[PDB]
Structures are given as structure tokens and as C-alpha cells.
Design a binder for this molecule. Structure first.
Ligand SMILES: OC[C@H]1O[C@H](O[C@H]2[C@H](O)[C@@H](O)[C@@H](O)O[C@@H]2CO)[C@H](O)[C@@H](O)[C@@H]1O
Ligand SMILES: OC[C@H]1O[C@H](O[C@H]2[C@H](O)[C@@H](O)[C@@H](O)O[C@@H]2CO)[C@H](O)[C@@H](O)[C@@H]1O
Ligand SMILES: OC[C@H]1O[C@H](O[C@H]2[C@H](O)[C@@H](O)[C@@H](O)O[C@@H]2CO)[C@H](O)[C@@H](O)[C@@H]1O
Ligand SMILES: OC[C@H]1O[C@H](O[C@H]2[C@H](O)[C@@H](O)[C@H](O)O[C@@H]2CO)[C@H](O)[C@@H](O)[C@@H]1O
Ligand SMILES: [Ca+2]
Ligand SMILES: [Ca+2]
Ligand SMILES: [Ca+2]
Length: 686
């Protein structure tokens, strides 16, 4: 379906309470009375935006070029205050994952918005927050709701009556946010003076409950999810949850793995997650550099190109990275740099670069504001004539129509500290983009080379951002002047004469799932699709999109190929799992002594466990881990494995110097749980 890939889309991120109040009657419900501020002066209270308000502004969003709305969390949040004028208006403090937040509407309202968005050709992804329930103080159960969790109104438990349930972790507050065990098993804290009750995704009831709640959003039409705080809960559950969701529908998943940029200690773990979990990630690596290049001017275009190259080498599916200039957790771009041309340039960069852009609501209306909560002001106007509105609409159309933006390679063609001219290319489709961030200097551009075919090219933006026309002859662009602060875009597209795969999505699943192949040149007459040479059953076949069912074949990463008119396409990978997954805590007791830098990994006889690999790079299906060691010399971590299956596995130490020390003896043998979760505990064999 169209939900599988968002490569041709523009994502628009909406903080529901601060967008549009389409129904004033749900502003201050009796269920959660007293959390509403009609004056819009108390920044952490509900101001009244809702799901009906989003639905009423669909014509505006369609005209802007939005093709996927990322809705901030829609599920029932804390019904009380959490300290002085502080409320769950943002949606990250969930008390009931089965019900829509009453300030925003009910399930009928959600269905109506989603159905109306789909009628307007716009998808809806939902921000889903599995890490925690609500604010609590460990020494006082009367604060807020004490972390209370409900199941469609039926009370489940809170932080204080959990002794015989184990729905929450009880390990204290995070102290070192970069310590992986703390970041996942200790509590998320808020500087306002409280902690968030940390759900135990290792508890079977909670894992199935969260799975059911995510599946319910998809059953109600959601086209995918933006999964909150994926660095804060075990990554086995991210992969097992993604499995369940792709069994339901070929939706799109992206996880927010905050920070951990290149060169940092936990960066490789984030890359491995993006490459193996079945969940794509938001592009924090590129965001940092975009803000320093176009915002603070502390980095240059060389740093921007270096980050495009570095992310391109690390992420297997870099075209699934979700890019952004700002969001609800950092100051708005215009509070970093109020120059609107620099904002226009940053927007053009993400609109034409690899991955799919996410534009934070109101960017196109020139909203400004410091960090949370001041970057969550009310959408001020719905003016369709701003330069930013016109730019986004125009470039969104280029992204929908030119395959080079969706799937293309990226090549640097001209660069200095201020100017970046890069080229996207997908077979014969080419887009050459020139950006000059310096608003006070023009540059003479000579020696520019391109893959554009011969001819004269007008700026696709029609000079909106100061762009100019160019003349191309045998791969050479005639010398021209790039104006101060300008953005200029030159493009070529044509029909394909052979099958060309731009995307296969989702990137993981089991036999029988629906998988979508997006591209060009498939023809109108049905041809064939193979996975590793195995013929797949075709569900639908069009010139640019094929839907297939994953064949009942052996598990592992395999190559998808399209054959049309006797000619075969390029290959694109797809990870076939060994069966529906379960998320399992693997513990190895009494392992041998280690030194700082030495880490233990798990490997075994299935692709989920690496097929006996000892490789620990960003590759797909290699050794699993590393394990953590809060209970050293015992080590543990949580991994997604096929449910109800007998597996063989061993652990190994990867010393700081790269040396490998395997457990001795015979392989450990175990049968995995049949439910959502379970535990497999063994003793290191000496
Ligand atoms: O109470 C802590 C914090 O909760 C929310 O922050 C989110 C953030 O917006 C997400 O993007 C991610 O980083 O996880 C956090 C917890 O879900 C609120 O948005 C923030 O105001 C509040 O301080
Ligand atoms: O002519 C091919 C050459 O083009 C570009 O080099 C630019 C350089 O980026 C600018 O800073 C300036 O010095 O003009 C040069 C062209 O004369 C590419 O960046 C380079 O890779 C390529 O070889
Ligand atoms: O390479 C496949 C092989 O991997 C594992 O064998 C390990 C063994 O456990 C270690 O003790 C040491 O001998 O290295 C071997 C890998 O070279 C599995 O145990 C074995 O079943 C599997 O075939
Ligand atoms: O400031 C709120 C954010 O806190 C955390 O961010 C951590 C980050 O994970 C860690 O890598 C860095 O070293 O420290 C910061 C701040 O303590 C959360 O992970 C974010 O989601 C929050 O927005
Ligand atoms: Ca309202
Ligand atoms: Ca509520
Ligand atoms: Ca957690």
C-alpha cells in the first residue's frame, strides 16, 4: 500500500493541543477538569487544540504539500496536575493506552480525522509512547496519579501497588543518561521535579498490552507510528513489536533515538538499531549539523557534506531516515537564527536530500520560540501566501514527482564554506540543488559538472528563493552567479525503459506479510517478483508500485528483484524473520572477568541471533548485543527471537582489542516462549 514508504512524502509534525481548536466543547472535560487555560499564558496547560481541529485544517495541509501528518500522542494522558500548572497537554504522560485523550476527541473523532486525511491523500502516523505512564514521586503516592495505568478504563496498577504484578521497573531515577542500563531500566526524570513511571516491557502483560494498543491504532487506520524514546526501553521489544505491526499491515515505523551523534559512545548501538530492528530512526546526526550550518553558523558546508557521507556509509536504509531542522524538544530554528532566507535554505536542504523531511508545525508561518515549552506556541495563522508555504508546496511536488529525490544517490558537485551544490540521481532521473547560505555574498560558480542531460534548465522554484536558470552541455554547467542566500533547483525526469526498484518496505517481516515495491519501469502488464530467487505471489502490479506477499521461504536477509518484459531490476534487501517473534531476556551467569571496553555478545543458529557471526558492526543479522552487566559477573540483554522455537546459542567476550573468547563446551539449547515475552537464563560454560 502507500503506507509502506514515505520517500515521496513531506511529514508535518503537529502538537495537537497547540494547532487548532476545532471543538471548544472538549476543552475542559469533567473527567480531567481544571487543566485548561483559555488565556494561552500558562505554557504547560491544555490550550484546546484537538483532532477535529486537525481535520478542519486538511485543505491547508494538502495545499502546503503535506502527505503524512505525524500526530503527537493521542492516547489518554494524566487527568490531574503534575505540580504547578503542569499537565499532559503534550501527550507523553499516558494513563490509558486504549483510549483517546478526552481533550482531543474520542475514537470516532480519531477515525473521522484519519478517514478524511486519507480521502485527501494524506497519511497519519501516530506518536506512541511505550516507555512510561505518568508523573510520580516515589515518596508520595498522592502526587498526580502515582503512575496509574488503566486498560480502557479498567484499573491495572500504579507505582505503589505493583509488588505482585511487576508492571513497572523499580530501579530509581536515571543519573547518567549515557549509561545504557540506566537509560533503559531507571526512570525518565523531568526538571520540574518528578519522575515518569517506567513500564516493564519485559513483563508479559505489559508487553502484550502495549502491542495491543499499537495494533488498535493501526486497526483504526493509522499508517504507521513514531515510536517515542526507543533508547529508553529494550531494543528486543522494538523489534518484536515492529514484527506484530507489520503482520497487521505494511505501515511505516520510525523511532526517536535521541542524540548519540557520530563519534559518541552509544552511536554504533543506534546505527545497529536502525539497521536491524525493523524500525527506522529520526536523523539526529544530520539535524545537529543542519542547525550549526544554517542556524548558528559554527559549522560549514564541508561539515554538512561530511555528515551526508558519514550517515550514507552507516545507515543501510538511509532513504528511510526522517530529517528535520527543529522539533518540540529543541528551540525553533528562528530563535536560533531569525534570518528567513537561512530558514528557507534549511527547509530546501531537507526537502531535496535523502530520507523524508519532517516539518514542525508552524515553521511555514514563521513561528519562533525557545526550548520546551516555548517552542509549542499556538499555530498563529494559516496564511497560504508566505514564502515558506510556497517553497514547501513547490518542493513537495518535486519530491512526489521526481524519483531522484525519493531514492537517489547523493553526490557533491561544488562546495566552499557557504555554498553546497549536490546532485540526487536515480537511474535517468536527476535533481541538481544549489544552496548558498551567505545572505550577503553572491558567488561565481565555475567548473560545475552534472549528470543532467543537455539543455537549458529554469529554476524549479521560479526564482522564489533567488534561483537562476542554467545551461548544460556535455555534463558541464556554464558559469553563472549564485545570488546571496539563494536556493536554485534544476531537474530532469523521464520514463524508465527497464524495471528500477527505489524501495522495498517494510524491511522486515514473516512469510505472508504484504510488502510494497516502489519504483519505475515495472510496466502495466504483470511480470514476476522474486525473493532470493523464490517467486512471490503478486497482490497488485502497477507501473510504479507492486504489492507482494512474502514467500514461505527460509529466513534471513534476501534480495528482492522485479522482472518485467524479460528484464530484471536492481536488487533490494529484505529481512525474512524465522516466525512471529517474542522478546526474551537472555541472561548469562558467572561469565569470566572482563576489563573496561570488553563486552559480551550473544550468537546462535538463526538469523535473529546472527547465524553464529562474531561480527559486531552495523551489519544486519550479526552478533547480538552487547549485553549489559548491572549484576556483574552476570550479563543480560533482551532480544527478539522467533516464538515457540528451539534454538542453539553461545555467548562470547569481544575484548577491547577485538579478540574473541567463546564460551567453551556444547551449544546451549532452549525453547523460546510462545507469548510476548520470556526469559532464558544459562551459566557461562568454562
Ligand atoms: O516529563 C518529561 C518530558 O516528557 C515529554 O518529553 C518527551 C519528548 O518530547 C519526547 O520527544 C521524548 O524525548 O521523550 C520525552 C518523554 O516521553 C514532554 O514533551 C516534555 O515536555 C516533558 O518534560
Ligand atoms: O570541476 C570539477 C570540480 O568541481 C568542484 O570543485 C569546485 C570546488 O568545489 C569549489 O570550491 C571551487 O574551487 O571550484 C571548483 C571547480 O572549479 C567539485 O567540488 C570537485 O569535486 C570537482 O572535481
Ligand atoms: O561457525 C559455526 C559454529 O559456531 C559455533 O562454534 C564455535 C564454538 O562454539 C567455539 O567453541 C569455537 O570453537 O569456535 C567455533 C566457531 O568457529 C557453534 O558452537 C557451532 O555449533 C557452529 O557450527
Ligand atoms: O533534556 C531532555 C532530554 O533528556 C534526555 O537526553 C539525554 C540524552 O539521551 C543523552 O544522550 C545526553 O547525553 O544527555 C541528554 C540530556 O540529559 C532524553 O533522552 C531526551 O529524550 C530528552 O529530551
Ligand atoms: Ca478543543
Ligand atoms: Ca486525560
Ligand atoms: Ca525504560
Amino acid at each position: 500500500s502507500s503506507s509502506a514508504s514515505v520517500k515521496g512524502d513531506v511529514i508535518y509534525q503537529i502538537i495537537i493541543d497547540r494547532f487548532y481548536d476545532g471543538d471548544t466543547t472538549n476543552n475542559n472535560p469533567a473527567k480531567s477538569y481544571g487543566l485548561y487555560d483559555p488565556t494561552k499564558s500558562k505554557w504547560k496547560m491544555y490550550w484546546g487544540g484537538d483532532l477535529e481541529g486537525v481535520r478542519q485544517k486538511l485543505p491547508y495541509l494538502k495545499q502546503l504539500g503535506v502527505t503524512t501528518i505525524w500526530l503527537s500522542p493521542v492516547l489518554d494522558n494524566l487527568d490531574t496536575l503534575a505540580g504547578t500548572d503542569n499537565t499532559g497537554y503534550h501527550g507523553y504522560w499516558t494513563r490509558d493506552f486504549k483510549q483517546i485523550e478526552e481533550h482531543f476527541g474520542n475514537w470516532t473523532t480519531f477515525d473521522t480525522l484519519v478517514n478524511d486525511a486519507h480521502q485527501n491523500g494524506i497519511k497519519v502516523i501516530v506518536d506512541f509512547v511505550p516507555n512510561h505512564s505518568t508523573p510520580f514521586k516515589a515518596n508520595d503516592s498522592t502526587f498526580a496519579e502515582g503512575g496509574a495505568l488503566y486498560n480502557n478504563g479498567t484499573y491495572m496498577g500504579n507505582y505503589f501497588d505493583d509488588a505482585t504484578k511487576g508492571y513497572f521497573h523499580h530501579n530509581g531515577d536515571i543519573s547518567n543518561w549515557d549509561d545504557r542500563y540506566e537509560a533503559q531500566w531507571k526512570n525518565f526524570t523531568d526538571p520540574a521535579g518528578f519522575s515518569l513511571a517506567d513500564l516493564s516491557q519485559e513483563n508479559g502483560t505489559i508487553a502484550q498490552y502495549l502491542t495491543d494498543a499499537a495494533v488498535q491504532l493501526v486497526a483504526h487506520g493509522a499508517d504507521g507510528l513514531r515510536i517515542d524514546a526507543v533508547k529508553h526501553f529494550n531494543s528486543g521489544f522494538s523489534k518484536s513489536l515492529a514484527d506484530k505491526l507489520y503482520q497487521k499491515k505494511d505501515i511505516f515505523l520510525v523511532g526517536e533515538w535521541y542524540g548519540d551523534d557520530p563519534g559518541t559512545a552509544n552511536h554504533l548501538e543506534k546505527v545497529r538499531y536502525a539497521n536491524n530492528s525493523g524500525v527506522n530512526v529520526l536523523d539526529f546526526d544530520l539535524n545537529t549539523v543542519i542547525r550549526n550550518v544554517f542556524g548558528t553558523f559554527t559549522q560549514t558546508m564541508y561539515d554538512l557534506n561530511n555528515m551526508v557521507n558519514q550517515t550514507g556509509n552507516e545507515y543501510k536504509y538511509k532513504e528511510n531516515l526522517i530529517t528535520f531542522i527543529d522539533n518540540h524538544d529543541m528551540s525553533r530554528f528562528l530563535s536560533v537564527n531569525s534570518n528567513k532566507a537561512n530558514l528557507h535554505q534549511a527547509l530546501a536542504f531537507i526537502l531535496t536530500s535523502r530520507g523524508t523531511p519532517s516539518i514542525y508545525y508552524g515553521t511555514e508561518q514563521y513561528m519562533a520560540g525557545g526550548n520546551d515549552p516555548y517552542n509549542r506556541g499556538m499555530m498563529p495563522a494559516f496564511d497560504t501566501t508566505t514564502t515558506a508555504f510556497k517553497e514547501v508546496s513547490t518542493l513537495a511536488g518535486l519530491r512526489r514527482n521526481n524519483a531522484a529525490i525519493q531514492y537517489g544517490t547523493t553526490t557533491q558537485r561544488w562546495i566552499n564554506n557557504d555554498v553546497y551544490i549536490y546532485e540526487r540521481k536515480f537511474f535517468n532521473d536527476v535533481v541538481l540543488v544549489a544552496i548558498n547560505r551567505n545572505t550577503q555574498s553572491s558567488y561565481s560558480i565555475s567548473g560545475l559538472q552534472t549528470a543532467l542531460p543537455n539543455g537549458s534548465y529554469a529554476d524549479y522554484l521560479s526564482g522564489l528563493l533567488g534561483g537562476n536558470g542554467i545551461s548544460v552541455s556535455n555534463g558541464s554547467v556554464a558559469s553563472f552567479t549564485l545570488a546571496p542566500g539563494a536556493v536554485s533547483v534544476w531537474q530532469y525526469s523521464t520514463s524508465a525503459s527497464a524495471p528500477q526498484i527505489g524501495s522495498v518496505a517494510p524491511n522486515m517481516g514473516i512469510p505472508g506479510n504484504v510488502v510494497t515495491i516502489d519504483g519505475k519501469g515495472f510496466g502495466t502488464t504483470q511480470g514476476t517478483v522474486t525473493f532470493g530467487g523464490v517467486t512471490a505471489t503478486v497482490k497488485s502490479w502497477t507501473s510504479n508500485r507492486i504489492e507482494v506477499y512474502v514467500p514461505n521461504m527460509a529466513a534471513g536477509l534476501t534480495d528482492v528483484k522485479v522482472t518485467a518484459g524479460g528484464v530484471s531490476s536492481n536488487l533490494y534487501s529484505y529481512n525474512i524473520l524465522s516466525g512471529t517473534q517474542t522478546s526474551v531476556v537472555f541472561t548469562v551467569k558467572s561469565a569470566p572477568p572482563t576489563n573496561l571496553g570488553d563486552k559480551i555478545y550473544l550468537t546462535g543458529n538463526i538469523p535473529e541471533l546472527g547465524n553464529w557471526s562474531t561480527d559486531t558492526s552495523g551489519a544486519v543479522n550479526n552478533a547480538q548485543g552487547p549485553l549489559l552487566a548491572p549484576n556483574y559477573p552476570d550479563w543480560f540483554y533482551v532480544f527478539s527471537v522467533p516464538a515457540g522455537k528451539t534454538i542453539q546459542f553461545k555467548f562470547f567476550i569481544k575484548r577491547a582489542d577485538g579478540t574473541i573468547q567463546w564460551e567453551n563446551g556444547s551449544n546451549h539449547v532452549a525453547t523460546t516462549p510462545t507469548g510476548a515475552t520470556g526469559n532464558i537464563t544459562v551459566t557461562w560454560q568454562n
